[PDB]
């Protein structure tokens, strides 16, 4: 079978010889070289010179060797990723999600990077794949992304409500976790809603593989049936009930509550459209609703509230 | 007299709950549902035309 891809990936990057320091300085002194070769060729390139044969030629190979020393450098310390990354397994993301980010990291830790300083590329480079890793698994692990700083503050609650935990033997209140942390209660309370994970709607509720969370949740958003129905019929009667109105009661109800397009008209606009003032309006208003109160086209739409 | 009471028994619906990902009605008394109109009584209305 052979399916294990970790497998697949540690018998490969088992192959290509672990360096030394003084390789390292070499290798370091060789990427540097191509890179400012590239450089120039670059700058030279614009509007520049008609190269002698030796000299363009061997600087392409320089530019070339470059290369190979960077990614000779990659595959010799592959195995230093997995070193690092090994220990955030069992958590979040996979191993070789994990692998990979470590490697992306690797790539800026080797680039961003300088051997004067006289130090072992591990010393350096140890810490930027931790980094990458750390953030992988906050962003790209949590279904709901969360951002970095609230994962690192959730983490530091999760460590300081377990390690209380295990010190007072019972679990933390959440103003002794405030205090402690020189935060406010109701923050920690934040904290620990956030630190929810969305259960699976894939589980056998049931004893036997039949009955899922799916199959048991109420959608409180569905149509009601008789509600749709029943406004339907409030529409019809509204209606109704207006058309007793005079037709300007009619058109000031309907333009003041936007029964007509959906638009709801105010004082000003209705005035405009009539061409009369807006307190005009607003008496035609109130008479109209005093009007609409009296029992005898009340009663009929009382039901629908 | 034994625990198989009528009133823990009688059900029935209208319009009720629906279920999330497939939009069938709900099952068990506890909420309304309705009885599985499985693929046994299926074929029984098959068979009558």
């Given at each position: 079978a052979s399916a294990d891809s970790v497998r697949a990936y540690l018998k490969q990057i088992g192959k290509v010889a672990l360096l030394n320091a003084e390789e390292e300085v070499e290798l370091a002194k060789r990427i540097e070289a191509g890179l400012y070769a590239t450089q120039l060729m670059t700058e030279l390139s614009e509007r520049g010179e008609k190269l002698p044969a030796a000299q363009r030629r061997d600087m392409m190979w320089i530019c070339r060797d470059g290369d190979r020393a960077k990614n000779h450098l990659l595959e010799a310390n592959l195995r230093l990723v997995v070193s690092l990354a090994k220990?955030?397994?069992?958590?979040?993301?996979?191993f070789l999600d994990l692998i990979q980010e470590g490697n992306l990291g690797l790539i800026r830790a080797v680039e961003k990077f300088d051997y004067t300083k006289g130090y072992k590329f591990s010393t350096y480079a140890t810490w930027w794949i931790r980094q990458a890793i750390t953030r992988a698994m906050a962003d790209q692990?949590?279904?709901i992304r969360i951002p970095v700083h609230m994962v690192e503050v959730i983490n530091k609650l999760g460590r300081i409500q377990r390690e209380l935990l295990q010190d007072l033997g019972r679990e933390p209140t959440p103003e002794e976790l405030a205090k402690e942390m020189d935060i406010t209660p109701e923050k920690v309370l934040e904290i620990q809603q956030y630190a929810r994970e969305p259960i699976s709607?894939?589980?056998?509720?049931?004893?036997?593989?039949?009955?899922?969370?799916g199959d048991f949740?109420?959608?409180?958003?569905?149509?009601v049936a008789v509600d749709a129905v029943s406004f339907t019929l409030l529409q019809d009667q509204l209606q109704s009930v207006l058309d007793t109105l005079s037709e300007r009661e009619a058109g000031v109800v309907r333009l003041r509550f936007g029964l007509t397009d959906g638009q709801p008209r105010t004082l000003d606009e209705i005035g405009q459209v009539y061409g009369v003032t807006r307190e005009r309006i607003r008496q035609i208003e109130s008479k109209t609703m005093s009007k609409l109160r009296h029992?005898?086209?009340?009663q009929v739409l009382r039901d629908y509230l | 007299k034994l625990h198989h009471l009528v009133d823990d028994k009688i059900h029935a619906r209208s319009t009720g709950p629906y279920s999330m990902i497939t939009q069938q009605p709900l099952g068990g008394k506890a909420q309304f549902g309705g009885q599985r109109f499985g693929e046994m009584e299926c074929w029984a209305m098959q068979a009558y035309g």
């Amino acid at each position: 079978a052979s399916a294990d891809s970790v497998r697949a990936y540690l018998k490969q990057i088992g192959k290509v010889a672990l360096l030394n320091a003084e390789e390292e300085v070499e290798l370091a002194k060789r990427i540097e070289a191509g890179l400012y070769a590239t450089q120039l060729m670059t700058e030279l390139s614009e509007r520049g010179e008609k190269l002698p044969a030796a000299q363009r030629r061997d600087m392409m190979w320089i530019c070339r060797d470059g290369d190979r020393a960077k990614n000779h450098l990659l595959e010799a310390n592959l195995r230093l990723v997995v070193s690092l990354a090994k220990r955030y397994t069992g958590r979040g993301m996979a191993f070789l999600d994990l692998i990979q980010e470590g490697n992306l990291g690797l790539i800026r830790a080797v680039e961003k990077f300088d051997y004067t300083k006289g130090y072992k590329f591990s010393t350096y480079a140890t810490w930027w794949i931790r980094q990458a890793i750390t953030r992988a698994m906050a962003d790209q692990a949590r279904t709901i992304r969360i951002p970095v700083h609230m994962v690192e503050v959730i983490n530091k609650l999760g460590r300081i409500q377990r390690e209380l935990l295990q010190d007072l033997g019972r679990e933390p209140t959440p103003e002794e976790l405030a205090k402690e942390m020189d935060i406010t209660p109701e923050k920690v309370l934040e904290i620990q809603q956030y630190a929810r994970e969305p259960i699976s709607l894939d589980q056998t509720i049931g004893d036997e593989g039949d009955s899922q969370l799916g199959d048991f949740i109420e959608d409180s958003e569905a149509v009601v049936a008789v509600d749709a129905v029943s406004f339907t019929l409030l529409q019809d009667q509204l209606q109704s009930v207006l058309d007793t109105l005079s037709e300007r009661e009619a058109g000031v109800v309907r333009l003041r509550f936007g029964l007509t397009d959906g638009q709801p008209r105010t004082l000003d606009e209705i005035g405009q459209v009539y061409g009369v003032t807006r307190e005009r309006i607003r008496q035609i208003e109130s008479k109209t609703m005093s009007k609409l109160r009296h029992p005898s086209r009340s009663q009929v739409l009382r039901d629908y509230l | 007299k034994l625990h198989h009471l009528v009133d823990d028994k009688i059900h029935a619906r209208s319009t009720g709950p629906y279920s999330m990902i497939t939009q069938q009605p709900l099952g068990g008394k506890a909420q309304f549902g309705g009885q599985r109109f499985g693929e046994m009584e299926c074929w029984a209305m098959q068979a009558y035309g």
